[PDB]
Symmetry: C3
Subunit: 413 residues, 3 copies
């Protein structure tokens, strides 16, 4: 049965203190993955759920508060207690959507062991706060209330069609050849193309040349985008961090400013003519007029009014006129729709979950139930995969994919 098989996936992908998103393909700890995965662990062991996030901060967080999207843990034997019991990993230099405070609030409020909850939350709170502070200091220099991503990887939605035009400005001349490894695990037709990776690496090399300095990265990056997904997730996380601060009796004045200015910013991304939220390209100084599943995420933030939520509900229904399974990652009528290729059409369980949560919060119970039912149907028939073809339901991407298993467990708790 579903829950039993989901637990098997999480335990197989566990490395003790963290969970790989998928064996082989993603053999390290990822930031937003660990946050979703921790919700799954609440169905197995509460301590284990906390440990996922302790590990992320303890081994990932940099001295300036930055939380990187990958912690490159060295491979260990799946045995405890090993020689290190009887007797500092590298990280990436970019971030990912900051869903972690939302998960921490949930762990804090619902852990049946209240002494443990207080100990873990008090430990993590100043670390979360330092991460959020880094985001505004490094990525919102104009005090807008919106944070900028400098790499499409930071959206978590690597090859979203939203990033096509911004990425077209990234130089690739004299880029040395490099060796792809994702193609050992996943068919290239389901992955970003060569032209995408060329530009992913060009950006990396620029940042590395700049010694990962925030000021020069902001000024020099040829990719500067206000991602609706990243920002909706940050607004939600700020609201949840505020609640933690009050419950723990810390001063949240700083967080209140982020919330209020962020509400203004996130609502600015709404395009009335399109009836949808768009990411913005700050190099071109233009909205990116591509409707992706990320544009539903302000529901999860809780910023729109009901009318606006109702227009999104209509749009989700429209996408459902063309795809059997909600929610495709891009509008199925978009000329960029590719039903098998990663973030250009396939259904993702984490986004179904966040968007169902948002719709529920706005009273759209039928739509929330549909998003759940489709997610669970996909996993029942095809197992725990990274994404699914919205037309056929076929599994795609990573096999034994952790957040799919995790959210199967969480959603059916």
């Amino acid at each position: 049965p579903l829950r039993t098989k989901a637990v098997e996936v999480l335990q197989r992908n566990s490395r003790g203190a963290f969970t790989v998103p998928a064996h082989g393909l993603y053999p390290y700890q990822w930031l937003w993955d660990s946050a979703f995965i921790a919700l799954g662990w609440t169905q197995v062991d509460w301590e284990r759920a906390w440990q996922e996030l302790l590990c992320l901060f303890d081994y990932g967080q940099g001295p300036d508060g930055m939380l990187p999207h990958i912690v490159f843990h060295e491979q260990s034997r799946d045995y405890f207690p090993g020689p290190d019991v009887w007797g500092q990993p590298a990280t990436s230099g970019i971030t990912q959507p900051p869903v972690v405070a939302t998960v921490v609030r949930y762990l804090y409020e619902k852990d049946p062991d209240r002494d443990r909850a207080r100990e873990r939350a008090r430990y993590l709170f100043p670390k979360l706060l330092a991460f959020h502070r880094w985001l505004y200091h490094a990525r919102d220099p104009y005090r807008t209330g919106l944070v900028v991503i400098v790499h499409p990887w930071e959206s978590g939605m690597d090859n979203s069609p939203a990033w096509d035009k911004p990425l077209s400005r990234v130089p690739v001349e004299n880029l040395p050849p490099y060796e792809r490894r994702d193609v050992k695990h996943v068919n290239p037709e389901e992955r970003p193309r060569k032209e995408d990776y060329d530009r992913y690496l060009s950006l990396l090399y620029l940042f590395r040349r700049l010694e990962y300095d925030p000021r020069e990265i902001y000024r020099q990056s040829p990719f500067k985008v206000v991602d609706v997904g990243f920002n909706a997730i940050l607004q939600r996380a700020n609201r949840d961090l505020y609640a933690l601060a009050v419950l723990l009796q810390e001063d949240p004045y700083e967080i209140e400013e982020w919330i209020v200015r962020g509400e203004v910013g996130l609502e600015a991304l709404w395009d009335r003519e399109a009836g949808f939220y768009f990411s913005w390209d700050l190099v071109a100084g233009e909205p990116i007029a591509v409707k992706t599943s990320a544009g539903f995420l302000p529901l999860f933030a809780g910023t729109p009014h009901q009318g606006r939520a109702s227009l999104l509900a209509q749009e989700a229904e429209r996408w459902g006129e063309k795809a059997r399974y909600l929610l495709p990652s891009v509008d199925p009528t978009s000329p960029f729709f590719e039903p098998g290729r990663y973030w250009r059409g396939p259904v993702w369980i984490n986004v179904n979950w966040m968007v169902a949560e948002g719709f529920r919060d706005y009273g759209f119970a039928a739509l929330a139930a549909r998003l759940k039912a489709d997610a669970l149907a996909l996993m029942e028939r095809e197992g725990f995969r990274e994404y699914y073809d919205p037309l056929t339901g076929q599994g795609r991407g990573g096999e034994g994919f952790s957040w799919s298993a995790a959210l199967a467990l969480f959603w059916t708790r």
Copy 2:
């Protein structure tokens, strides 16, 4: 008829400048009672409505701006002009929900005598402002936007089941015996229990020992709660105080900050899993997971979005599946539901009124009409009582209860 009998109750309970909540039982002036009662007086004499609140501030307000929940006026003969015309009462050391600015705005805008309205509002405005300022200075030291109550009495909902766990931490060892007087007027089965009063008095004695010093009260009180009711009422009152400030041409910059930070705070109390607003226990650092009628009061504040209001509408409908009369003070399916005991189940007219107001403002006209109809039916059949059994409709608590009469008059104006 209802209105004639209501006027009789108010006139019987009048002591000239203020109205007792009920003869014998409550033989002094109470803060939130006087505010609701003033609305009733608008149906008799506008000057008399203003006088209620002038009296509250003139004889109640302390030098630091604190407005106490009781002004202990000495008994006077019900004759005017007496010897004091031909020829400084004590107060309590705690507060109550600050509904007064909302009432003052209404008196100001609707008094047919505009010169009197301007004179009274100009007089009260700096006093209201000083009270609100005291609340944040004394009860929001961490600049959260939410105010803390240190005594269950300050909620106005003395024995709400929400306060059970917080109150369990209040020491009662070596508490001297004391003599209850409420039981002269009301059956003990309809009142807080001995164990409640023991802890009410323990807190009083602690505050008295500390000479009512705010800093030490905040640090030392074993009862520290963010009450959803108190805070929803404060948010509404801040919005109304802002409007008064602008109309009177005073600078409302200070009030704007309270409003904006309070909106963030009040919305934080929403629990998505429960689909309801909870008060928070700041000693435990946890939401109090008990659904009381106070959790509907953010509607009166005007902070939720419509989706959230619709989830509350569903919950009110649920309570109506189990109780004949809305709105019981606690969920009728709660294990703590006691249909006769004060704030643990009985229907209260003031809360029916505030919640109907809120639902109306969100477009839920049928629900608002039901809350009105039930309130009026209860008073028609059982007279003007403090609260009513939600299953049978039987009157309970104080007899000839002032805010019930007052709001009968106001609601049918």
Copy 3:
């Protein structure tokens, strides 16, 4: 056909760089007219749309940032290139509703020539910002978030019944006779009365005597009103200016404060008993209890919650029970309703458009469609007139009226 005839009106009323609102009657450039007219020009020539607003700022904006409601351009021959190519107009001393930033955002985002869009927006942005800054500095000295108008002309709704009581305080003793010129073009029955103009001119003479000094104008004007229309339009314009700032990579911190404080202020104008938004009279210190079409404009600002929007939808439906054509400028049951007289009842195309936009944004598609259909029906049958009788549909006021033509073109794009 409609669009062809609309283009003829705009081209006839063009003076090259700006468009007169109507030949003869309004032979200069007006502030809010030019903003609506620019939307019409997008259907003819994008450069021409920008030029309308460049002209307004370049020849209108004063040294302190004030944008005046009229730029008194001298008459030129309708020939180019004239002698000035082969070989500083006066302005008014009051302002008008600041819809211009909203129009600039639209031109910026939708111009197919991106290089031109960036050039024009970068040029206008600091000018818009200076105008908004002037509004708060001169007209919000108490830091309320709401701006005051000192002349009914500044509402754009010159003789709205809302201004009757405030205008009654303006002295007319010893006012010299003057010579009306509007009556050359429009029947007096469709225009403000003598008693209105007497008070319009009295205010002008006061401001002129004070050398148009903001401090003394605020202190001495016998007319000081918080106009719901002006403020709803300003809130919308602030939101749109914020978006421009972020897209252009300018610091919007200042604008964020205007938005947040303005949201508090605009929502304060809601009267729960009336179920409508009122303008406020700051001399009397009272809401003006007259329901005009301006009270729907907070929908265009995007400040109400859905419940409140639904109460406005009900009110619009009510007005439609009494008038064939929505939206009359005042409640058709008002004792002040005059179906032919300017802003006291007639239907206006610009207000139909803004209110339809607002209703659409709140999910009220049927109502938005009705407002569009009525506007287009009126223009099809009666041509492009300043306003229309809501009972009969008969054209009234200015002939060949520019914003009617412009918005016919924009609405049917």
